[PDB]
Tab-separated table of C-alpha atoms and ligand atoms in Angstrom:
chain	number	residue	atom	x	y	z
A	1	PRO	CA	102.304	96.501	143.276
A	2	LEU	CA	99.960	96.507	140.241
A	3	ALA	CA	101.387	93.291	138.867
A	4	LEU	CA	100.145	91.605	142.013
A	5	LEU	CA	96.571	92.748	141.371
A	6	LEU	CA	96.708	91.798	137.694
A	7	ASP	CA	97.853	88.216	138.227
A	8	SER	CA	95.961	87.402	141.420
A	9	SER	CA	92.848	88.578	139.509
A	10	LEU	CA	93.857	86.463	136.511
A	11	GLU	CA	94.701	83.568	138.815
A	12	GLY	CA	91.749	84.024	141.130
A	13	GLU	CA	93.605	84.746	144.363
A	14	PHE	CA	90.703	86.681	145.969
A	15	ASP	CA	92.391	86.891	149.389
A	16	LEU	CA	95.513	88.294	147.754
A	17	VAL	CA	93.632	90.678	145.437
A	18	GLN	CA	91.912	92.036	148.560
A	19	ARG	CA	95.210	92.465	150.400
A	20	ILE	CA	97.146	94.514	147.799
A	21	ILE	CA	94.289	96.559	146.373
A	22	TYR	CA	94.828	98.834	149.351
A	23	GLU	CA	98.594	98.862	148.663
A	24	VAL	CA	97.701	101.075	145.680
A	25	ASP	CA	94.077	101.986	146.497
A	26	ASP	CA	94.585	103.905	143.276
A	27	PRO	CA	94.929	100.700	141.148
A	28	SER	CA	94.769	102.559	137.818
A	29	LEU	CA	95.668	99.236	136.209
A	30	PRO	CA	96.408	99.498	132.563
A	31	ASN	CA	99.267	97.107	131.682
A	32	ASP	CA	101.323	97.638	128.473
A	33	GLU	CA	98.557	95.971	126.389
A	34	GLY	CA	95.684	97.806	128.037
A	35	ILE	CA	94.402	94.869	130.037
A	36	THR	CA	93.482	95.716	133.613
A	37	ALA	CA	92.602	93.654	136.702
A	38	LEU	CA	88.897	93.901	135.799
A	39	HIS	CA	89.694	92.585	132.316
A	40	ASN	CA	91.580	89.587	133.811
A	41	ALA	CA	88.821	88.763	136.311
A	42	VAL	CA	86.049	88.917	133.684
A	43	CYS	CA	88.250	86.874	131.343
A	44	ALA	CA	89.287	84.155	133.788
A	45	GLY	CA	85.689	84.246	135.045
A	46	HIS	CA	86.003	85.168	138.710
A	47	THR	CA	82.651	86.763	139.445
A	48	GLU	CA	83.471	87.410	143.076
A	49	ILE	CA	86.629	89.329	142.058
A	50	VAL	CA	84.671	91.042	139.284
A	51	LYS	CA	82.145	92.057	141.951
A	52	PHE	CA	84.793	93.131	144.456
A	53	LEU	CA	86.793	95.277	141.968
A	54	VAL	CA	83.747	97.018	140.456
A	55	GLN	CA	82.363	97.483	143.950
A	56	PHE	CA	85.783	98.834	144.905
A	57	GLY	CA	85.173	101.398	142.189
A	58	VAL	CA	87.362	100.036	139.421
A	59	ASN	CA	86.501	101.689	136.080
A	60	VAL	CA	84.024	99.373	134.373
A	61	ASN	CA	84.822	100.764	130.950
A	62	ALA	CA	88.579	100.263	130.685
A	63	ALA	CA	89.545	99.580	127.029
A	64	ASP	CA	92.606	97.646	125.944
A	65	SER	CA	94.729	97.810	122.735
A	66	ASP	CA	91.890	96.825	120.435
A	67	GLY	CA	89.229	98.714	122.368
A	68	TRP	CA	87.960	95.681	124.289
A	69	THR	CA	86.273	96.660	127.550
A	70	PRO	CA	85.285	94.139	130.307
A	71	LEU	CA	81.745	94.033	128.822
A	72	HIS	CA	83.251	93.003	125.463
A	73	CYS	CA	85.118	90.296	127.455
A	74	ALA	CA	81.966	89.202	129.361
A	75	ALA	CA	79.915	88.917	126.147
A	76	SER	CA	82.624	87.022	124.259
A	77	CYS	CA	82.292	84.579	127.164
A	78	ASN	CA	78.471	84.650	126.719
A	79	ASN	CA	78.280	85.602	130.391
A	80	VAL	CA	74.826	87.222	130.851
A	81	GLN	CA	75.123	87.295	134.640
A	82	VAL	CA	78.381	89.220	134.607
A	83	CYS	CA	76.922	91.324	131.735
A	84	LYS	CA	73.845	92.132	133.849
A	85	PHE	CA	76.152	93.076	136.757
A	86	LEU	CA	78.493	95.377	134.733
A	87	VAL	CA	75.585	97.115	132.938
A	88	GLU	CA	73.976	97.498	136.336
A	89	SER	CA	77.179	99.193	137.449
A	90	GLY	CA	77.894	101.387	134.406
A	91	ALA	CA	79.043	99.453	131.362
A	92	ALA	CA	79.220	101.579	128.180
A	93	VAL	CA	76.992	99.296	126.064
A	94	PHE	CA	77.944	101.033	122.816
A	95	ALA	CA	81.723	101.058	123.302
A	96	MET	CA	83.156	99.463	120.201
A	97	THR	CA	86.384	97.775	119.266
A	98	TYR	CA	88.809	99.675	117.049
A	99	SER	CA	89.432	97.552	113.955
A	100	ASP	CA	86.245	95.684	113.376
A	101	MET	CA	84.355	98.351	115.368
A	102	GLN	CA	81.923	96.168	117.241
A	103	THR	CA	80.025	96.349	120.534
A	104	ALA	CA	79.923	93.781	123.342
A	105	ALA	CA	76.618	92.406	121.988
A	106	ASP	CA	78.416	91.616	118.703
A	107	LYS	CA	81.134	89.723	120.623
A	108	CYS	CA	78.777	87.046	122.017
A	109	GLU	CA	79.837	83.429	121.369
A	110	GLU	CA	83.283	83.007	119.773
A	111	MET	CA	81.508	80.753	117.266
A	112	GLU	CA	78.686	78.357	118.276
A	113	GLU	CA	80.464	78.330	121.689
A	114	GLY	CA	78.924	77.935	125.168
A	115	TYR	CA	75.422	78.859	124.020
A	116	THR	CA	74.993	82.515	123.126
A	117	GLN	CA	71.544	83.749	124.320
A	118	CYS	CA	73.683	86.403	126.098
A	119	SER	CA	73.452	88.383	122.900
A	120	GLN	CA	69.722	88.819	123.462
A	121	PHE	CA	70.340	90.505	126.819
A	122	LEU	CA	72.838	92.913	125.380
A	123	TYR	CA	70.815	93.432	122.208
A	124	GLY	CA	67.825	94.083	124.425
A	125	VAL	CA	69.577	96.912	126.266
A	126	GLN	CA	70.900	98.496	123.056
A	127	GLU	CA	67.296	98.549	121.956
A	128	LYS	CA	65.394	99.386	125.160
A	129	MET	CA	67.853	101.832	126.674
A	130	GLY	CA	66.675	105.401	126.917
A	131	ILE	CA	63.068	104.212	126.663
A	132	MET	CA	62.849	101.703	129.514
A	133	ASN	CA	63.421	102.899	133.118
A	134	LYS	CA	60.882	105.559	132.069
A	135	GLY	CA	63.363	106.920	129.556
A	136	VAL	CA	65.926	107.657	132.252
A	137	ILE	CA	69.581	107.367	131.338
A	138	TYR	CA	72.984	108.275	132.764
A	139	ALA	CA	76.084	109.943	131.351
A	140	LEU	CA	79.161	107.709	131.736
A	141	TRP	CA	81.292	110.606	130.454
A	142	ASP	CA	81.289	114.387	130.102
A	143	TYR	CA	80.271	116.002	126.785
A	144	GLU	CA	81.299	119.352	125.346
A	145	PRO	CA	78.861	120.356	122.576
A	146	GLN	CA	80.128	120.998	119.014
A	147	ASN	CA	76.755	122.037	117.696
A	148	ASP	CA	74.227	124.251	119.433
A	149	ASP	CA	71.455	121.654	119.683
A	150	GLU	CA	73.538	119.434	121.985
A	151	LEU	CA	73.103	118.942	125.724
A	152	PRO	CA	76.191	119.575	127.806
A	153	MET	CA	76.884	116.489	129.905
A	154	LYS	CA	79.213	115.736	132.753
A	155	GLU	CA	80.490	112.592	134.416
A	156	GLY	CA	77.320	110.975	135.665
A	157	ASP	CA	74.165	112.959	134.912
A	158	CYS	CA	70.647	111.564	135.040
A	159	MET	CA	68.366	112.472	132.143
A	160	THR	CA	65.294	111.361	130.212
A	161	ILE	CA	65.582	110.715	126.498
A	162	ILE	CA	62.777	112.722	124.878
A	163	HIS	CA	62.740	109.873	122.347
A	164	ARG	CA	65.536	109.214	119.829
A	165	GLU	CA	65.441	107.175	116.542
A	166	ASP	CA	66.551	107.425	112.878
A	167	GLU	CA	64.905	110.629	111.489
A	168	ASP	CA	67.864	112.701	112.627
A	169	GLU	CA	70.811	110.704	113.909
A	170	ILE	CA	70.966	107.064	115.046
A	171	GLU	CA	74.096	107.775	117.040
A	172	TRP	CA	72.475	110.715	118.793
A	173	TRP	CA	69.728	110.501	121.469
A	174	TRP	CA	67.459	113.547	122.061
A	175	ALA	CA	67.325	113.986	125.833
A	176	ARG	CA	66.108	116.277	128.581
A	177	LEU	CA	68.630	116.950	131.326
A	178	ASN	CA	67.364	118.897	134.312
A	179	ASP	CA	65.108	121.344	132.449
A	180	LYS	CA	67.037	121.737	129.203
A	181	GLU	CA	66.845	119.419	126.185
A	182	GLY	CA	69.125	118.484	123.267
A	183	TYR	CA	71.331	115.955	121.427
A	184	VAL	CA	73.454	113.454	123.326
A	185	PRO	CA	75.828	110.812	121.951
A	186	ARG	CA	74.430	107.407	122.929
A	187	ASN	CA	78.029	106.169	123.049
A	188	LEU	CA	78.689	107.718	126.451
A	189	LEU	CA	75.418	106.559	128.056
A	190	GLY	CA	74.246	103.569	130.054
A	191	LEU	CA	71.071	102.607	131.958
A	192	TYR	CA	73.221	102.606	135.104
A	193	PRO	CA	70.262	100.665	136.598
B	1	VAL	CA	91.638	128.311	105.305
B	2	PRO	CA	91.623	126.825	101.794
B	3	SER	CA	89.705	128.863	99.218
B	4	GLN	CA	86.314	127.624	98.060
B	5	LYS	CA	86.020	130.234	95.261
B	6	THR	CA	84.968	128.868	91.866
B	7	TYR	CA	87.480	129.260	89.046
B	8	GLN	CA	86.757	127.953	85.535
B	9	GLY	CA	90.000	129.041	83.964
B	10	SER	CA	91.349	128.846	80.449
B	11	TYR	CA	89.919	125.333	79.947
B	12	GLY	CA	86.401	125.912	81.232
B	13	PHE	CA	86.480	123.644	84.272
B	14	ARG	CA	83.172	122.689	85.841
B	15	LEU	CA	81.679	119.758	87.725
B	16	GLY	CA	78.889	117.379	86.740
B	17	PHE	CA	76.953	114.823	88.800
B	18	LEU	CA	74.852	111.833	87.873
B	19	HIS	CA	71.076	112.427	87.792
B	20	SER	CA	70.115	109.747	90.282
B	21	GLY	CA	66.974	110.440	92.223
B	22	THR	CA	65.891	110.196	95.826
B	23	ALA	CA	64.754	106.561	95.728
B	24	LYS	CA	65.703	104.871	98.995
B	25	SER	CA	67.907	102.693	96.798
B	26	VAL	CA	70.367	105.415	95.748
B	27	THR	CA	73.864	105.241	97.186
B	28	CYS	CA	74.920	108.745	96.256
B	29	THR	CA	72.670	111.632	95.178
B	30	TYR	CA	73.353	115.270	94.320
B	31	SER	CA	70.955	118.199	94.881
B	32	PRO	CA	71.302	121.099	92.443
B	33	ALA	CA	69.086	123.296	94.574
B	34	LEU	CA	71.267	122.731	97.619
B	35	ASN	CA	74.568	122.244	95.675
B	36	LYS	CA	74.858	119.313	98.015
B	37	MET	CA	75.842	115.652	97.630
B	38	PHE	CA	74.260	112.970	99.781
B	39	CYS	CA	76.162	109.658	99.971
B	40	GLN	CA	76.763	106.524	102.013
B	41	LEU	CA	79.965	106.017	103.970
B	42	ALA	CA	82.541	104.348	101.622
B	43	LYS	CA	80.355	103.904	98.523
B	44	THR	CA	81.231	105.181	95.005
B	45	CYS	CA	80.632	108.905	94.433
B	46	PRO	CA	81.027	109.669	90.751
B	47	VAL	CA	82.201	113.240	90.217
B	48	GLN	CA	82.509	114.415	86.608
B	49	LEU	CA	84.929	116.936	85.206
B	50	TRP	CA	83.640	119.058	82.365
B	51	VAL	CA	86.106	121.117	80.354
B	52	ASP	CA	85.976	123.069	77.039
B	53	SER	CA	89.501	122.528	75.679
B	54	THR	CA	91.656	119.597	76.691
B	55	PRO	CA	94.191	120.417	79.498
B	56	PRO	CA	97.889	119.820	78.733
B	57	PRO	CA	99.591	116.492	79.638
B	58	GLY	CA	100.651	116.277	83.264
B	59	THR	CA	97.465	117.974	84.530
B	60	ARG	CA	96.309	116.671	87.894
B	61	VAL	CA	92.974	116.747	89.811
B	62	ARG	CA	92.841	117.287	93.568
B	63	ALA	CA	90.102	117.039	96.285
B	64	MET	CA	89.891	118.490	99.881
B	65	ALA	CA	87.272	118.757	102.681
B	66	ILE	CA	86.756	121.817	104.901
B	67	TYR	CA	84.156	122.633	107.564
B	68	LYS	CA	81.297	124.775	106.179
B	69	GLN	CA	80.628	126.916	109.304
B	70	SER	CA	82.979	129.864	109.942
B	71	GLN	CA	83.385	128.942	113.593
B	72	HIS	CA	84.887	125.545	112.554
B	73	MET	CA	86.647	126.465	109.328
B	74	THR	CA	90.096	126.339	110.954
B	75	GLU	CA	89.773	122.775	112.262
B	76	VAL	CA	91.280	120.330	109.719
B	77	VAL	CA	88.708	117.759	108.550
B	78	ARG	CA	89.838	114.257	109.431
B	79	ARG	CA	88.400	110.913	110.466
B	80	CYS	CA	87.074	110.253	113.991
B	81	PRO	CA	89.173	108.204	116.492
B	82	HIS	CA	87.484	104.885	115.685
B	83	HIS	CA	87.521	105.209	111.926
B	84	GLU	CA	91.067	106.369	111.982
B	85	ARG	CA	91.915	103.021	113.652
B	86	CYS	CA	89.575	100.452	112.078
B	87	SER	CA	90.900	98.015	109.497
B	88	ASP	CA	89.689	99.464	106.201
B	89	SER	CA	92.872	100.415	104.380
B	90	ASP	CA	93.112	99.869	100.686
B	91	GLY	CA	96.896	100.028	100.982
B	92	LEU	CA	97.133	103.417	99.415
B	93	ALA	CA	95.131	105.704	101.663
B	94	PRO	CA	96.411	107.296	104.899
B	95	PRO	CA	94.171	106.066	107.768
B	96	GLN	CA	93.130	109.550	108.868
B	97	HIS	CA	92.078	110.752	105.414
B	98	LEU	CA	88.347	111.321	104.870
B	99	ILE	CA	88.346	111.260	101.053
B	100	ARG	CA	89.667	108.397	98.954
B	101	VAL	CA	89.732	107.744	95.189
B	102	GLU	CA	88.770	104.221	94.151
B	103	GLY	CA	89.897	102.344	91.042
B	104	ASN	CA	93.053	104.324	90.240
B	105	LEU	CA	96.582	102.965	90.846
B	106	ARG	CA	97.962	106.419	90.207
B	107	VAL	CA	96.214	108.122	93.112
B	108	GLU	CA	98.438	110.133	95.495
B	109	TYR	CA	97.694	111.306	99.015
B	110	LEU	CA	98.966	114.423	100.784
B	111	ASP	CA	99.415	115.515	104.412
B	112	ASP	CA	100.297	119.217	104.097
B	113	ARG	CA	103.586	119.860	105.853
B	114	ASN	CA	102.404	123.340	106.722
B	115	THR	CA	98.607	123.426	106.912
B	116	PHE	CA	98.139	119.790	108.041
B	117	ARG	CA	95.205	119.472	105.675
B	118	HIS	CA	94.676	116.218	103.848
B	119	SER	CA	94.048	115.833	100.098
B	120	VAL	CA	94.017	113.241	97.241
B	121	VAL	CA	95.291	113.727	93.637
B	122	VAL	CA	95.067	111.661	90.425
B	123	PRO	CA	96.290	112.368	86.869
B	124	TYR	CA	93.857	114.076	84.515
B	125	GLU	CA	92.683	111.764	81.745
B	126	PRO	CA	90.630	113.285	78.879
B	127	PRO	CA	87.165	111.837	78.033
B	128	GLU	CA	86.807	108.235	76.888
B	129	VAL	CA	86.449	107.217	73.234
B	130	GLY	CA	82.755	108.165	73.229
B	131	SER	CA	82.315	110.472	76.223
B	132	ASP	CA	81.940	114.176	77.099
B	133	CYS	CA	83.500	114.249	80.545
B	134	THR	CA	85.953	112.365	82.718
B	135	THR	CA	84.669	110.673	85.884
B	136	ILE	CA	86.457	110.164	89.186
B	137	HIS	CA	85.101	107.766	91.814
B	138	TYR	CA	85.422	109.132	95.350
B	139	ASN	CA	84.707	107.484	98.720
B	140	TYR	CA	84.023	109.306	101.998
B	141	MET	CA	85.360	107.362	105.009
B	142	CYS	CA	83.373	108.763	108.010
B	143	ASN	CA	79.723	109.774	108.556
B	144	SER	CA	78.784	113.410	109.109
B	145	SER	CA	77.523	112.350	112.517
B	146	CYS	CA	80.766	110.615	113.604
B	147	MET	CA	81.222	111.666	117.231
B	148	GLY	CA	84.782	112.865	117.613
B	149	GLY	CA	85.091	113.319	113.858
B	150	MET	CA	82.875	115.627	111.802
B	151	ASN	CA	80.585	115.352	114.869
B	152	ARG	CA	77.493	116.422	113.015
B	153	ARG	CA	79.160	119.490	111.486
B	154	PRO	CA	78.662	120.211	107.744
B	155	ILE	CA	81.663	120.129	105.442
B	156	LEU	CA	82.419	121.076	101.826
B	157	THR	CA	84.518	119.280	99.224
B	158	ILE	CA	86.756	121.419	96.976
B	159	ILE	CA	88.010	120.042	93.639
B	160	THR	CA	90.852	121.813	91.860
B	161	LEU	CA	92.532	121.337	88.482
B	162	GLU	CA	96.284	121.959	88.560
B	163	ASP	CA	99.280	121.746	86.247
B	164	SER	CA	102.063	119.160	86.759
B	165	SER	CA	103.798	121.881	88.734
B	166	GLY	CA	100.893	122.386	91.162
B	167	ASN	CA	99.603	125.673	89.767
B	168	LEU	CA	95.839	126.270	89.747
B	169	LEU	CA	93.915	125.822	86.526
B	170	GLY	CA	90.404	125.604	88.018
B	171	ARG	CA	88.398	125.222	91.277
B	172	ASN	CA	84.843	124.128	92.169
B	173	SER	CA	83.118	122.794	95.297
B	174	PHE	CA	79.933	121.288	96.722
B	175	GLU	CA	78.558	120.570	100.180
B	176	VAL	CA	78.617	116.954	101.311
B	177	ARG	CA	76.626	114.937	103.769
B	178	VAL	CA	77.659	111.374	104.494
B	179	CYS	CA	74.601	109.570	105.801
B	180	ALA	CA	72.868	106.201	105.735
B	181	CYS	CA	69.817	107.431	103.811
B	182	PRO	CA	71.134	109.714	101.037
B	183	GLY	CA	67.824	109.969	99.124
B	184	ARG	CA	65.628	110.417	102.206
B	185	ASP	CA	67.841	113.200	103.613
B	186	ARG	CA	67.967	115.004	100.247
B	187	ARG	CA	64.154	114.862	99.946
B	188	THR	CA	63.628	116.075	103.504
B	189	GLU	CA	66.197	118.847	103.193
B	190	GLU	CA	64.665	119.950	99.882
B	191	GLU	CA	61.226	119.873	101.540
C	1	ZN	ZN1	83.951	108.140	111.732
C-alpha cells in the first residue's frame, strides 16, 4: 500500500519503509497533490530513507502540484549534503516551479533560515555543468528535435557539451553525442556524477 | 492556416514601427530589412496603424501569431507548459495566449471554436489630437527559445483591421523574435 510508504517516509519508519517497498516494488508514488515518498523523506529530513529510496531507483525528479521536485525540497531546507547526493544520482538542476518558475538553487533558505551557503553548491553546478567533468553530461530525459540543428536524445545518454553560452541560446547547450553534434535543452540534463 | 497576405483596403492600412536602434538598451526593435521585430519577453511593443481615411465607428484591430516555416504552419502558436502555468495574469488574458495588449480595458481575447487559434482585439481609435497614427502596445509572453513552446521556431504576427461585424478591412504582418538581447540579435542577423 502506497500510503504506507508515504507516511513511514514522512514519519521516518525506515524498517517499515523497507518492508512495504517490496509490496509494490513499483512504488510510482504520486499522491493527489504530487508529493511522493522521496518528497516526504527529503522534507522530513531522513537522509537514510532518501538514500534507500533513490538507491531503490525512485525517480529523483518527481514534481508535485507546483513543480517542486525533491531537489527543490532539499535546497529550501538548505541541505547541501542531500543536494550533493541527489545531483550525484540524477537531479534535474534546472527543473523549475510552475508559478514563480524557479530552480532548486533559487529555493535555498526560506528567508535568513538555517544558513544558506547551499545556494553556492547549486549555483556552482548550474554554472559549471557541461564544462566540468571534462564537459561530460547526461540526458535525464529523451528529446525529439523540432529544429534540424538539435541532437536527438534518449533517457540517459552521455555526451560532451561542445561549449554553450549566450550567443545563441542560454537555454540550449551545444553538445556532441557519440559522433554527432547539435543543440540540447539544458533543462533535461544533469552531471549525473 | 491563417492568411499572411497584405491587404491595404479602402482606408490604406499599413503598419509603422518606432525607429529605435540596436543599442543594448533597447527593449523592442524593428528591422526594415528583415521585416522583423526583436523584443524582450513581456515588454511594451508599440505597433502603429497608419491609414489614409478614417475607418467607420465600430472598427476593430486584431493580432495573431503563426509559425513561419511551412512544416510547422499547422501547429497553433501557444505558450510553453511553464509559461502557461506561471502566475503572470493581468486578469484579462487567457493563460495560454502568447500575445497580449497592455493599457486597454477594452481588449478582448479569442480562442477560435473551430481553428483553436488564439487572438486579441481592441477597438480602433483614430489618431490623437496631434498625431498621424494610432499606437497599440503589445506584449509577447514566451521566448522564441521556450522549450515546449515556440521551441526555437520562428513565428509571424498578423495584424488585421476589421469592421464591427468581423469583416476584413486590411491585413499586414511581420516576423517576430522574442529574445533577451533584441538589439544584439538584430545587429547580428543584419550582419
Ligand atoms: Zn515560455
